[PDB]
Design an enzyme around this catalytic site. Structure first.
Site, PDB file in Angstrom:
ATOM      1  N   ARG A  75       0.832  -1.214   0.000  1.00 36.36           N
ATOM      2  CA  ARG A  75       0.000   0.000   0.000  1.00 36.36           C
ATOM      3  C   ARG A  75       0.868   1.266   0.000  1.00 36.36           C
ATOM      4  NH1 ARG A  75      -3.322  -2.261   2.438  1.00 36.36           N
ATOM      5  NH2 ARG A  75      -4.823  -0.707   3.217  1.00 36.36           N
TER       6      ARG A  75
ATOM      7  N   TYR B 190       8.105  -1.268  -9.243  1.00 34.88           N
ATOM      8  CA  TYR B 190       6.897  -2.074  -9.457  1.00 34.88           C
ATOM      9  C   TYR B 190       5.767  -1.295 -10.123  1.00 34.88           C
ATOM     10  CZ  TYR B 190       3.244  -5.485  -8.711  1.00 34.88           C
ATOM     11  OH  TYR B 190       2.257  -6.433  -8.941  1.00 34.88           O
TER      12      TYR B 190
ATOM     13  N   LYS C 179      -0.605   4.723 -14.622  1.00 35.74           N
ATOM     14  CA  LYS C 179      -1.443   5.484 -13.703  1.00 35.74           C
ATOM     15  C   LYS C 179      -0.998   6.945 -13.611  1.00 35.74           C
ATOM     16  CE  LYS C 179      -3.974   1.858 -12.653  1.00 35.74           C
ATOM     17  NZ  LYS C 179      -5.342   1.627 -13.216  1.00 35.74           N
TER      18      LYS C 179
ATOM     19  N   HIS D 156     -10.654   5.655 -15.447  1.00 33.82           N
ATOM     20  CA  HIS D 156     -10.309   4.265 -15.113  1.00 33.82           C
ATOM     21  C   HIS D 156     -11.398   3.363 -15.731  1.00 33.82           C
ATOM     22  CE1 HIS D 156      -9.161   1.323 -11.579  1.00 33.82           C
ATOM     23  NE2 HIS D 156      -8.463   1.078 -12.671  1.00 33.82           N
TER      24      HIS D 156
ATOM     25  N   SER E 220     -10.327  -1.520  -9.339  1.00 32.50           N
ATOM     26  CA  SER E 220      -9.472  -2.700  -9.384  1.00 32.50           C
ATOM     27  C   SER E 220     -10.183  -3.881  -8.706  1.00 32.50           C
ATOM     28  CB  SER E 220      -8.110  -2.412  -8.721  1.00 32.50           C
ATOM     29  OG  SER E 220      -7.220  -3.489  -8.933  1.00 32.50           O
TER      30      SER E 220
ATOM     31  N   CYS F 257     -12.727  -5.648  -9.782  1.00 35.28           N
ATOM     32  CA  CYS F 257     -14.163  -5.670 -10.068  1.00 35.28           C
ATOM     33  C   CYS F 257     -14.497  -5.996 -11.520  1.00 35.28           C
ATOM     34  CB  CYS F 257     -14.798  -4.337  -9.664  1.00 35.28           C
ATOM     35  SG  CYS F 257     -14.631  -3.995  -7.906  1.00 35.28           S
TER      36      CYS F 257
ATOM     37  N   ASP G 208      -8.616  -0.807 -19.462  1.00 35.91           N
ATOM     38  CA  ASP G 208      -8.253  -0.130 -18.196  1.00 35.91           C
ATOM     39  C   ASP G 208      -8.278   1.396 -18.176  1.00 35.91           C
ATOM     40  OD1 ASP G 208      -7.110  -0.634 -15.338  1.00 35.91           O
ATOM     41  OD2 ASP G 208      -5.614   0.711 -16.212  1.00 35.91           O
TER      42      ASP G 208
ATOM     43  N   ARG H 182       0.652  -9.870 -12.021  1.00 37.88           N
ATOM     44  CA  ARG H 182       0.213  -9.328 -13.306  1.00 37.88           C
ATOM     45  C   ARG H 182       0.813 -10.045 -14.513  1.00 37.88           C
ATOM     46  NH1 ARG H 182      -3.934  -5.030 -13.246  1.00 37.88           N
ATOM     47  NH2 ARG H 182      -3.981  -4.451 -11.018  1.00 37.88           N
TER      48      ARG H 182
ATOM     49  N   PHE I 193     -19.783 -13.101 -15.938  1.00 33.50           N
ATOM     50  CA  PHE I 193     -18.821 -13.382 -16.992  1.00 33.50           C
ATOM     51  C   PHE I 193     -19.509 -13.310 -18.355  1.00 33.50           C
ATOM     52  CE2 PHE I 193     -17.155 -15.100 -13.034  1.00 33.50           C
ATOM     53  CZ  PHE I 193     -15.951 -14.399 -12.968  1.00 33.50           C
TER      54      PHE I 193
HETATM   55  N1  LIG Z   1     -18.796 -12.866  -9.600  1.00 30.01           N
HETATM   56  C1  LIG Z   1     -18.234 -12.260 -10.664  1.00 30.01           C
HETATM   57  N2  LIG Z   1     -16.935 -11.948 -10.547  1.00 30.01           N
HETATM   58  C2  LIG Z   1     -16.293 -11.331 -11.541  1.00 30.01           C
HETATM   59  C3  LIG Z   1     -16.995 -11.002 -12.776  1.00 30.01           C
HETATM   60  N3  LIG Z   1     -16.091 -10.427 -13.585  1.00 30.01           N
HETATM   61  C4  LIG Z   1     -14.928 -10.392 -12.906  1.00 30.01           C
HETATM   62  N4  LIG Z   1     -15.057 -10.945 -11.693  1.00 30.01           N
HETATM   63  C5  LIG Z   1     -14.041 -11.054 -10.647  1.00 30.01           C
HETATM   64  O1  LIG Z   1     -13.247  -9.867 -10.711  1.00 30.01           O
HETATM   65  C6  LIG Z   1     -11.884 -10.215 -10.472  1.00 30.01           C
HETATM   66  C7  LIG Z   1     -11.068  -9.969 -11.731  1.00 30.01           C
HETATM   67  O2  LIG Z   1     -11.039  -8.579 -12.038  1.00 30.01           O
HETATM   68  P1  LIG Z   1      -9.674  -7.736 -12.122  1.00 30.01           P
HETATM   69  O3  LIG Z   1      -9.003  -8.126 -13.398  1.00 30.01           O
HETATM   70  O4  LIG Z   1      -8.894  -7.810 -10.827  1.00 30.01           O
HETATM   71  O5  LIG Z   1     -10.304  -6.250 -12.195  1.00 30.01           O
HETATM   72  P2  LIG Z   1      -9.902  -5.013 -13.130  1.00 30.01           P
HETATM   73  O6  LIG Z   1     -11.119  -4.110 -13.083  1.00 30.01           O
HETATM   74  O7  LIG Z   1      -9.431  -5.500 -14.456  1.00 30.01           O
HETATM   75  O8  LIG Z   1      -8.742  -4.349 -12.203  1.00 30.01           O
HETATM   76  P3  LIG Z   1      -7.381  -3.534 -12.626  1.00 30.01           P
HETATM   77  O9  LIG Z   1      -6.755  -4.332 -13.735  1.00 30.01           O
HETATM   78  O10 LIG Z   1      -6.615  -3.576 -11.338  1.00 30.01           O
HETATM   79  O11 LIG Z   1      -7.881  -2.150 -12.987  1.00 30.01           O
HETATM   80  C8  LIG Z   1     -11.882 -11.691 -10.080  1.00 30.01           C
HETATM   81  O12 LIG Z   1     -12.063 -11.828  -8.658  1.00 30.01           O
HETATM   82  C9  LIG Z   1     -13.108 -12.243 -10.775  1.00 30.01           C
HETATM   83  O13 LIG Z   1     -13.618 -13.403 -10.102  1.00 30.01           O
HETATM   84  C10 LIG Z   1     -18.418 -11.381 -12.836  1.00 30.01           C
HETATM   85  O14 LIG Z   1     -19.086 -11.146 -13.838  1.00 30.01           O
HETATM   86  N5  LIG Z   1     -18.956 -11.993 -11.774  1.00 30.01           N
HETATM   87  O1  LIG Z   2      -4.431  -0.842  -9.824  1.00 31.91           O
HETATM   88  C1  LIG Z   2      -5.022  -0.888 -10.923  1.00 31.91           C
HETATM   89  O2  LIG Z   2      -6.236  -0.492 -11.152  1.00 31.91           O
HETATM   90  C2  LIG Z   2      -4.249  -1.433 -12.043  1.00 31.91           C
HETATM   91  O3  LIG Z   2      -3.040  -1.813 -11.907  1.00 31.91           O
HETATM   92  O4  LIG Z   2      -4.810  -1.441 -13.155  1.00 31.91           O
HETATM   93 MN   LIG Z   3      -7.590  -5.088 -15.583  1.00 28.92          MN
HETATM   94 MN   LIG Z   4      -6.751  -0.413 -12.945  1.00 27.11          MN
END
Ligand SMILES: Nc1nc2c(ncn2[C@@H]2O[C@H](COP(=O)(O)OP(=O)(O)OP(=O)(O)O)[C@@H](O)[C@H]2O)c(=O)[nH]1
Ligand SMILES: O=C([O-])C(=O)[O-]
Ligand SMILES: [Mn+2]
Ligand SMILES: [Mn+2]
Ligand code: NA
Length: 611
Positions: free
Chosen positions: A83, A231, A240, A260, A282, A284, A307, A401, A519
């Site tokens: 953090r 990192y 970012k 974002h 992130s 989500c 992203d 990553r 999904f």
């Molecule tokens: N239950 C559920 N989980 C989801 C869905 N889509 C993604 N996830 C969850 O979201 C997470 C993956 O999302 P990330 O790749 O970390 O999110 P991101 O928004 O790309 O984050 P950054 O790359 O950090 O900006 C995992 O825990 C998946 O299980 C969905 O439709 N349903």
């Molecule tokens: O932290 C985040 O959202 C990333 O690395 O995309």
């Molecule tokens: Mn992502």
């Molecule tokens: Mn991000």
């Protein structure tokens, strides 16, 4: 009068004389300060890239993953992935230009540092910091090289890992310098903070300086200055620091948006195509959505970006978006054939992985990969210790990553590099809410939609926290002013304001189970948005916005999904929701809260009171 400022003798690739004047002054001025042994002006070539990877391999900095075509593994010092919000700062003359002044009394919306304090911090870190190292000069474009929405940066770094990762995540090399000419650029200065000879021991062959780590942004000087971390967002300064923090301020000044968000193109069974943008925090699922494999027959999803979105209204009033990145810097854990099959296809060649596990046959592993290994295949974890599934600790860092070229995505959009961008017809907000918030709703107007972004909350990874616009870590300036900037889009000439939806993939029932499969099934939600954008009477009015009518969503192929719980809207829940939002905006935005947002708050409170 001597040799003087002239660092020509130390240049091991390229020429200081070839550089544009201002690029030269930036390089040479920082070479004088940081005292690198050599200067390497990056050309972006395949040869440069492969040789640097092999050098890192020979030094024990990365390992080759023999199971794939040109892929690699970096394991970091565990201190260099923590953090770092406290150490991520923006410098402006006045604090209020960076964060609203909170009523009581610590801001969650950014971190300001005075010019005076930053100058002292800088002088305590940068002098001599690259001694015995190569300073790499990375000329890079955020966005497609020809785009009038693209912006150029120059990153100076003492990390080969940054060079390799930036080649993937941006467009970099000689072409960028030639496109730049005498134009403006963002000055990006990075050091791992470990001059030679090393004063402290090197951990896991990963140079960093956690005690002095500081990631600073100087929007008025068009500068990013980062020290001590090798990192991710701390070192790959395009992502970012530039494309969200600096860019959001440039966007405020110039009339556009830096967010974002993902960007995707969705085509229906009658061949009609629409582009959508989506802001989730992130963890989500932006990357899952951007590369979606839809389940509904005859639909197609194609990826523009996963992203960061840069967006500007054109003279026709279309909201044109580009992806400023050149690759995907995606979360590895959770990525499988079932959660993201198109990512799996993308990352099997020319990809750099960081902090994932390695299989004995030279492949990658992580939590949620959902791929059985043969008996006898063993796994090395991310801390370089043997690892068994029954052990308590995780095998791959939970935020580890991949870094992969966007051109390798099998559903990359045919217009993903179009210099004019793609026309956005809808904007989606969302996050993790286990209770109260339905699967999808549509905002009632632009002003309500801006309120919906502002009010976003999400479960931390238990605690629910505010994350307006998924931008809480990233605002380049005062959040209240950001809201006013969003609101001002409704005063533009001919602006075709996109429909604002809010989604929730993550609602749960009383025992802890997710009510929606998600999904590929999210294609069913996107179908509803596509028609609503088209003007289909598929919407029912509620206090929070429009939701799908009974029977409006295609639910065939899913079992008895509990729609009553999933679309439920409770007066008691929403009464609590509004008070919490009220107190947060009052405290955190205070005198800079736009009249229109306070008005949307009042209206929502009133609609709830009449349930
Ligand atoms: N239950 C559920 N989980 C989801 C869905 N889509 C993604 N996830 C969850 O979201 C997470 C993956 O999302 P990330 O790749 O970390 O999110 P991101 O928004 O790309 O984050 P950054 O790359 O950090 O900006 C995992 O825990 C998946 O299980 C969905 O439709 N349903
Ligand atoms: O932290 C985040 O959202 C990333 O690395 O995309
Ligand atoms: Mn992502
Ligand atoms: Mn991000
Ligand atoms: Na290492």
């Amino acid at each position: 009068l001597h040799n003087g400022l002239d660092f020509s003798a130390k240049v091991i690739q390229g020429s200081l004389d070839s550089l544009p004047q201002e690029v030269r002054k930036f390089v040479e001025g920082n070479a004088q300060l940081c005292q690198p042994e050599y200067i390497h002006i990056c050309d972006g070539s395949e040869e440069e890239y492969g040789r640097l990877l092999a050098h890192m391999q020979e030094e024990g900095v990365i390992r080759k993953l023999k199971k794939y075509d040109n892929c690699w593994l970096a394991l970091t010092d565990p201190r260099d992935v923590a953090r770092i919000a406290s150490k991520t700062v923006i410098i402006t003359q006045e604090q209020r230009d960076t964060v609203p002044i909170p009523k009581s009394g610590q801001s969650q919306l950014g971190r300001w540092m005075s010019e005076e304090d930053f100058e002292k911090a800088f002088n305590a870190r940068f002098p001599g910091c690259m001694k015995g190292r190569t300073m790499y000069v990375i000329p890079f474009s955020m966005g497609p090289l020809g785009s009038p929405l693209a912006k150029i940066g120059i990153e100076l770094t003492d990390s080969p890992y940054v060079v390799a990762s930036m080649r993937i995540m941006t467009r970099m090399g000689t072409s960028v310098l030639e496109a730049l000419g005498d134009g403006e650029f963002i000055k990006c200065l990075h050091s791992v903070g470990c001059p030679l000879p090393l004063k402290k021991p090197l951990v896991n062959n990963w140079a960093c300086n956690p005690e002095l780590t500081l990631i600073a942004h100087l929007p008025d000087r068009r500068e990013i200055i980062s020290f001590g971390s090798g990192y991710g967002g701390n070192s790959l300064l395009g992502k970012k620091c530039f494309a969200l923090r600096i860019a959001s301020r440039l966007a405020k000044e110039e009339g556009w948006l830096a967010e974002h968000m993902l960007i995707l193109g969705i085509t229906n069974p009658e061949g009609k195509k629409k582009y959508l943008a989506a802001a989730f925090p992130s963890a989500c699922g932006k990357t899952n959505l951007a590369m979606m494999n839809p389940t509904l027959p005859g639909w197609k999803v194609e990826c523009v970006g996963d992203d960061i979105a840069w967006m500007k209204f054109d003279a026709q009033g279309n909201l044109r978006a580009i992806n400023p990145e050149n690759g995907f810097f995606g979360v590895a854990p959770g990525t499988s054939v079932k959660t993201n099959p198109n990512a799996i296809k993308t990352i099997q060649k020319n990809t750099i992985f960081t902090n994932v596990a390695e299989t004995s046959d030279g492949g990658v592993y992580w939590e949620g990969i959902d791929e059985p290994l043969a008996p006898g295949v063993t796994i090395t974890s991310w801390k370089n210790k043997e690892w068994r599934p029954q052990d308590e600790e995780p095998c791959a860092h939970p935020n580890s990553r991949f870094c992969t070229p966007a051109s390798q995505c099998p559903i990359i959009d045919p217009a993903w590099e179009s210099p004019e961008g793609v026309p956005i017809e809808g904007i989606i907000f969302g996050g993790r809410r286990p209770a109260g918030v339905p699967l999808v709703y549509e905002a009632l107007s632009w002003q309500h939609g801006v309120f919906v972004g502002a009010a976003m909350r999400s479960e931390a990874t238990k605690v629910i926290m505010h994350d307006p616009f998924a931008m809480r870590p990233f605002f380049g300036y005062n959040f209240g002013k950001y809201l006013a900037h969003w609101l001002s889009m409704a005063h533009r000439p001919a602006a075709k304001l996109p429909k604002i939806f809010h989604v929730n993939w993550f609602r749960k029932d009383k025992n802890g189970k997710f009510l929606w499969p998600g999904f590929g099934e999210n294609s069913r939600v996107l179908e509803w948005m596509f028609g609503r954008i088209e003007g289909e009477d598929s919407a029912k009015l509620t206090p929070i916005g429009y939701v799908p009518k009974e029977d409006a969503l295609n639910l065939k192929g899913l079992g008895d999904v509990n729609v009553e719980e999933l679309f439920g809207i409770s007066k008691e829940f929403w009464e609590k929701e509004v008070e919490e939002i009220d107190k947060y905006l009052e405290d955190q935005v205070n005198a800079d809260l736009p009249y229109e947002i306070e008005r949307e708050l009042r209206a929502l409170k009133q609609r709830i009171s009449q349930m």
